[PDB]
Design a protein around this ligand. Structure first.
Ligand SMILES: Cc1cc2nc3c(=O)[nH]c(=O)nc-3n(C[C@H](O)[C@H](O)[C@H](O)COP(=O)(O)OP(=O)(O)OC[C@H]3O[C@@H](n4cnc5c(N)ncnc54)[C@H](O)[C@@H]3O)c2cc1C
Length: 447
């Protein structure tokens, strides 16, 4: 019930009707600070709470793999909310128009939303703010420490962000109070899939590349992955996280991205787990430090998807090497289909296509080779964002814009030895990787 987790977006006259939670990022009933705030507001006002989610015009920019994972999540979610006597309302169109009408049509007293630093979410907040007059808040349901309270500027390195975040953990890492009760999606899933079908990813024989069985969706399937990580894989996490031949990661990012599970719930469960001291340190650095510095990156950098947000040393170094002859230059088409000269890059591209989740270690190798085989850093940023958002279940996400800005621009990194083309940007070599794991097995597994 910490008030540091909320920000007033607009302040206006409180209406006589239900409190309305505009679900955007945190698509779950449990462990959701934004749902809990909206309910407490409704308790004080002697009104019910309702959930509204807007299905936007932008799903045609992604693929069936994301569209189905999210909707099957929401189908389980509607049931779970109704059992707590919370109705959920799904709107087709974009939020500026559809939230505004719902607020005026149902006489809402207060409007609430969850936090996301992304540009599109800011776009929608701007349209909505104009079209309403009731008060408007946003809660950070997605970070353990509220993005605005973690740091008041862009943190340039993880080593400066780490002591700030761990200092506030004692106040913000706490158990979740239970969600108090109050006192179709099948049609839109099928409609969307037909609109999306002519863009479905196929591999020549028209049989589809995506394998929808590696990650079942929704809050229920998320707990089991979290429970199976701690039970089975956390012990070994600290050593094998950088070996893509043996999947010992959490596998939580798809669920974290759609907000089907709270990173705070994950940190709570990992804290009390008695595992290897160093695996827990490694794991907590990723879900606390690197995930939440990625929200810090997008919140404090309007140009988080452009060259301009690169650090100075990195921009002038890449600018120094702009006219360096590239060893190869591939188009978007060849990158996508996986038709470069590097079998390791290509197998990584296929793990992304077949499963929707590239191993984290080769996500680094994959993105940096795009900087190497592109005409410019600006083209390399485009190509990485496009393929990352199109094919990753966990993409269209701060961790993606930050993970690419790290790979291609040295954001949250430091200068390395100066090379042709890529300047001082940390370099990763095919020879380097086989020294680090069994590179042939990875290739064979994705052929
Ligand atoms: C080029 C590139 C692009 C990326 N694109 C995305 C993306 O679109 N979406 C996404 O969620 N992550 C992205 N990542 C970050 C990272 O790859 C993923 O979080 C990770 O691969 C997800 O799988 P996991 O949970 O099983 O990994 P785990 O080893 O279990 O990590 C646990 C969680 O910690 C967080 N985390 C781990 N590594 C990072 C990181 N480098 N930066 C930020 N958070 C991290 C994630 O929430 C992750 O799910 C990207 C990384 C790179 C280098």
């Amino acid at each position: 019930m910490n008030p540091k987790r909320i920000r007033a977006l607009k302040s206006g006259k409180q209406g006589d009707g239900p409190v309305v939670y505009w679900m955007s990022r945190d698509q779950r009933a449990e462990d959701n600070w934004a749902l809990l705030f909206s309910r407490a507001i409704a308790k004080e006002a002697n009104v019910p709470v309702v959930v509204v989610f807007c299905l936007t015009d932008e799903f045609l920019e992604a693929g069936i793999r994301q569209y189905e994972f999210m909707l099957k999540g929401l189908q389980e979610l509607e049931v779970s909310l109704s059992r707590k006597k919370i109705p959920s309302f799904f709107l087709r169109g974009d939020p500026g128009e559809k939230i505004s009408r719902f607020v005026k049509d149902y006489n809402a007293g207060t409007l609430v939303t969850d936090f996301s630093p992304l540009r599109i979410k800011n776009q929608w907040i701007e349209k909505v703010i104009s079209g309403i007059s009731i008060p408007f808040f946003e809660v950070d349901a997605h970070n353990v420490v509220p993005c605005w309270e973690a740091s008041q500027k862009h943190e340039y390195a993880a080593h400066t962000f780490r002591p700030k975040l761990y200092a506030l953990l004692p106040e913000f890492l706490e158990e979740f109070p239970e969600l108090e009760p109050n006192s179709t999606l099948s049609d839109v899933l099928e409609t969307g899939v037909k609109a999306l079908l002519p863009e479905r990813a196929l591999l020549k024989n028209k049989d589809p590349l995506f394998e929808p069985w590696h990650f079942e969706p929704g809050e229920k399937a998320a707990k089991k992955v979290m429970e199976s990580f701690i039970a089975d894989r956390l012990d070994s996490y600290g050593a094998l996280r950088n070996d893509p031949t043996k999947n010992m990661l959490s596998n939580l990012s798809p669920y974290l991205h759609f907000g089907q599970i709270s990173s705070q719930r994950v940190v709570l469960e990992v804290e009390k787990a008695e595992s290897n001291p160093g695996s827990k340190k490694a794991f907590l650095d990723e879900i606390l430090i690197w995930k939440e510095i990625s929200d810090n990156f997008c919140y404090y950098n309007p140009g988080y998807d452009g060259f301009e947000s690169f650090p100075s040393w990195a921009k002038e170094s890449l600018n120094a090497h702009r006219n360096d002859v590239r060893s190869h230059i591939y188009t978007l088409e060849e990158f996508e289909a996986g038709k470069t000269h590097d079998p390791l890059w290509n197998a990584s591209q296929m793990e992304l296509l077949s499963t929707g989740k590239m191993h984290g270690y080769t996500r680094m190798y994959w993105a940096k080779k795009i900087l190497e085989w592109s005409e410019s850093p600006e083209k390399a940023l485009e190509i990485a964002i496009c393929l990352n958002d199109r094919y990753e279940l966990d993409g269209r996400d701060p961790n993606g814009y930050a993970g690419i800005a790290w790979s291609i621009g040295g954001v949250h990194d430091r200068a390395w030895g100066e090379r042709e083309v890529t300047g001082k940007i940390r370099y990763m070599s095919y020879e380097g990787c086989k020294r680090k794991f069994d590179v042939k097995l990875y290739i064979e597994k994705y052929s």
